[PDB]
Amino acid sequence: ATAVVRCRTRLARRVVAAVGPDGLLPAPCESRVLESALALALLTEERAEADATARLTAYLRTTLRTAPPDPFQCAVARAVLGDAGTALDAGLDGFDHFTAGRKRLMFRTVLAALGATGFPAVPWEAYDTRPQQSWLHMEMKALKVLAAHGTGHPDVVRDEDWRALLPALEPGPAWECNNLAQLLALLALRHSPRHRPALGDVLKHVAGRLRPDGGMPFIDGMTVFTTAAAGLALSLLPAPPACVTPMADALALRRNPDGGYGFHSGVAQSDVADTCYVLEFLRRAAPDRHRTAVAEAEGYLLALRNPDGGFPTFARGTSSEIAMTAAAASALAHDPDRREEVDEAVRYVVRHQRPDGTFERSWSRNATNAVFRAVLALTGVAAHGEERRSRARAAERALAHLAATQNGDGGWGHAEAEPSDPISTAYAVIALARGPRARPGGPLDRALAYLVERQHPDGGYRSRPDQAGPRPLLYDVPALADVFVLLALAHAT
Ligand SMILES: CC(C)=CCC/C(C)=C/CC/C(C)=C(\F)COP(=O)(O)OP(=O)(O)O
Ligand SMILES: [Mg+2]
Ligand SMILES: [Mg+2]
């Protein structure tokens, strides 16, 4: 076969082999500077776990010298190891997202709590947030408490503020698998005498979470998202492997009561991104065997839909997002009775395409992610007449954006002038596979050649990460590189 089909075959063998007997693809998260700095400040303040704090310190120094992250995470590390204002500006430099205002408050309060700058001079209600992802309520309350105590106004804190932090005192792994949220809550809780009896036991577990490199990961892992994406890729191969069945079973038995899926085992918060991948996978690999879970996932998505036709990530009434809306459109299009909601979602996508053919950055920091999501919805949903033309013109502009920004090596990076990486290129490939058939030396041809070239001798891919959280801060789940390249090659072959 062609070099691309051979590449696809070697990668599929590797992804199949990585799926365990429990049907899950392990997907641990790498250490991150931000959480390792917060863990270091917490353990230092409590004079606890000397061995762990020594390793955290060495991890932070090594990482700053060899692989420094964005300016905000660097300023955080420097504050705990020891300009805050300019680092925050460069970190949120052109962060064009509906959460920018909240991120400015969050990030500045983090830095102030670590003694690098003053606390924001804002009304205490600024830390109020409507219910969204479960752990966000806890994070904002933690920051409010830290600011209240940090500025000398502890009496400001109300019992409803403390109550939101109680999950951080539970034994074992972090609530919702989110180490950042627990660390912020514990930094706040250590200021409360009536909560300190529970603090000692949890610092022991926090300290035990360190990874081999001495750091602390953002989250425990992303095995639900990764397993679902990998099953989708494998189910798109000409002859899908047998393992797709235990993978579908592993996902289905983890569904939440609302019918959706969280990003890892034990995450009770469902989200649209995870659910759409599981739904797409189950629809292809086990539509009868898991008919009930499929129906429950569709119901989950429809219950989240916003009145504007778009879909949020976590909760109805939070701002719709383009990538989530395109994903839900594609996932819901397999039933002809949801046509009205699918059409309204695709129209939302078209309405929000930018004048240069792009869409948005949100949970991915490359522009190609939202392009690939949008192009699949624009070209995957059936449509005719006026609506077909409108969607085809929008898809054409998106694919033209890809062609206009393709790097010389055939790949794409996080931004137009960034070096290529396999994940960003994988997303572009999925979109381009909906354009005209590949030709010698054309954009899709060259992107496939790039991916062929970047394959490791062990058949895998090592990529710069693209996932962000809290946005726009990158975190690294290495298992995703192989999975998304395979999804790209399955789409394109
Ligand atoms: C699965 C995908 C790709 C999309 C949905 C987001 C998920 C479930 C990602 C897993 C990691 C995680 C806890 C976050 F990114 C949420 O960040 P955080 O709550 O800090 O985000 P902000 O709302 O503050 O930006
Ligand atoms: Mg957050
Ligand atoms: Mg978080």
Mutational pocket test of ligand 1: of 471, 475, 477, 480, the residue with most ligand atoms within 8 Å of the beta carbon: 471
Which atom of ligand 1 is found nearest the CA of 181? 20
CA distance 148 to 251: 42
Report the distance separating Cα 209 and Cα 202, nearest Å.
11
Ligand 1 is surrounded, with C-beta below 6 A, by 99, 133, 136, 178, 219, 225, 263, 271, 273-274, 313, 363, 467, 469-471
Q: Resolution, rounded to a tenth of an Å?
A: 2.0
Cα(120)–Cα(103) distance, integer angstroms: 12
For the residues of 183-208, what is the DSSP string, one character each? HHHHHHHTT-GGGGGGHHHHHHHHHH
Closest residue CA from atom 23 of ligand 1 = 470
Domain boundaries, the chain: 3-27+221-492, 33-208
- Write down the experimental method used for this entry: X-ray
Ligand 1: atom nearest CA of 97 is: 25
Are 316 and 305 within 8 A, CB to CB?
A: yes
* CA distances in angstroms from 14 to 75, 318, 455, 456, listed in the order given: 39, 39, 12, 11
For residue 228, the ligand closest to its alpha carbon is 1
**Which residue is closest in CA terms to ligand 1's atom 18?**
470
Nearest residue to 244 via CA among 286, 200, 277, 298: 286
Closest ligand 1 atom, residue 177 Cα: 13
Dihedral of the CA atoms 176, 179, 182, 183 (nearest 10)?
A: -170
Q: Secondary structure of 85-116 in the HEC alphabet?
A: HHHHHHHCCCCCCCCHHHHHHHHHHHHHHCCC
Q: What is the DSSP string of 457-487?
A: TTS-------BBSSTT-B---THHHHHHHHH
Cα dist. 339→23, 285, 301, 327 in Å? 33, 23, 14, 15
Q: Whose CA is nearest to atom 15 of ligand 1?
A: 469
Output the CA angle 338-339-341, nearest 5 degrees: 70
Ligand 1: nearest atom to the Cα of 132: 23
Query: 362 C-alpha to center of ligand 2: Å?
Result: 13
Q: Can you tell me which residue has the tokens 């679902």?
A: 228
**Nearest protein CA to atom 10 of ligand 1, as residue:** 263
Which of 363, 372, 484 for mutating ligand 1's site (highest number of atoms within 8 Å of CB)? 363
Q: Is 441 left (phi over 0), alpha (psi -120 to 50) or beta?
A: left
Q: How many CB atoms lie within 10 A of CB 442?
A: 15
Cα–ligand 3 centroid distance for 72 (angstroms): 15
Q: Which ligand minimizes its atom distance to the CA of 314?
A: 1
Backbone angles phi, psi at 28, to 5 degrees: -70, 155
How far is it between the farthest Cα atoms of the chain?
A: 72
**What DSSP string runs through 349-362?**
HHHH--TTS----S
**Tokens coding 5:** 């089909």
Distance CA 294, CA 260 (A): 10
Per the CB < 8 A criterion, the answer to whether 51 and 35 are in contact is: no
**Ligand 1 atom closest to the CA of 103, numbered from 1:** 24
C-alpha–C-alpha distance, residues 448 and 458, integer Å: 18
Q: Are 98 and 319 in contact (CB under 8 A)?
A: yes
**95 Cβ contact list (under 8 Å, min separation 6):** 103, 471, 472
The residues, any chain, with a CB within 8 Å of residue 213's CB and separated by 6 or more, are 31, 59, 62
Q: How far apart, in whole angstroms, are the C-alpha atoms of residue 392 and residue 390?
A: 6
- By the 8 A CB rule, do 61 and 81 touch? yes
Residue 486 alpha carbon to ligand 2 centre in Å: 30
Class of CATH domain 3-27+221-492: mainly alpha
- Among left, alpha and beta (phi > 0; psi -120 to 50; other), residue 69 is beta
Among 136, 232, 219, 152, residue whose Cα is nearest residue 191: 152
Amino acid at 23: G
Spatial CB neighbours of 273, under 8 Å, sequence gap ≥ 6: 225, 263, 313, 323, 324, 327, 363
Q: Are 432 and 426 in contact (CB under 8 A)?
A: no
Contact 110, 130 (CB under 8 A): no
Contacts of 231 (CB under 8 A, 6+ apart): 244, 247, 248, 251, 281, 285
Ligand 2 centre to CA of 257 (Å) is 23
| Cα–Cα distance, 404 to 173 (Å, whole number) | 46
What separation in angstroms does the CA of 195 have from each of 145, 161, 185, 344?
13, 13, 11, 49
CB 41 within 8 A of CB 65: no
